[PDB]
């Protein structure tokens, strides 16, 4: 330890945590490396047969719809 230009005993050694949350984090990690990816594609037409989450009313084997209801 130097004394002729450095203070003796430091008080910059504080806390057992230095975890960031109120600012920037996980930009390439936060303890050890991360790097994420994104896959979405236009709609979820990823298959020849889908389910519907906005309409769940049962399929009629009819051939008329708007013109079927007079």
């Amino acid at each position: 330890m130097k004394k002729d230009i450095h203070p003796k005993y430091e008080e910059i050694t504080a806390s057992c945590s230095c975890g960031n949350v109120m600012k920037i984090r996980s930009t390439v990690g936060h303890d050890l490396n991360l790097d994420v990816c994104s896959k979405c594609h236009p709609f979820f037409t990823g298959k020849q047969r889908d389910v519907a989450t906005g309409g769940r009313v049962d399929r009629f084997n009819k051939r008329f719809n708007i013109p079927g209801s007079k």
Partner: protein, 100 residues
Amino acid sequence: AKQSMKAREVKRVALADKYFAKRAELKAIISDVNASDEDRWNAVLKLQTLPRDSSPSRQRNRCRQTGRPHGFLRKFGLSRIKVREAAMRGEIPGLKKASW
């Protein structure tokens, strides 16, 4: 102006009415939310290929009799200029103008 654009258009309108009228809930079965893992499959697109060559979505309700591109009026069977020519000559019932 061409006969080829009138010839395409005339055949599309009689078969749009033939083919799509009896295939109007097929539209619901293969696109709309009326299916929910039910069909949604190749077996009904086996049938929607008929209303395709001749269907409302290719029949701009125009040029089935007259050789004027756009401004058509499906209610007269005519276009801008031929509506005016027939009014001039009185060949339309009730044709006057608004004065109010």
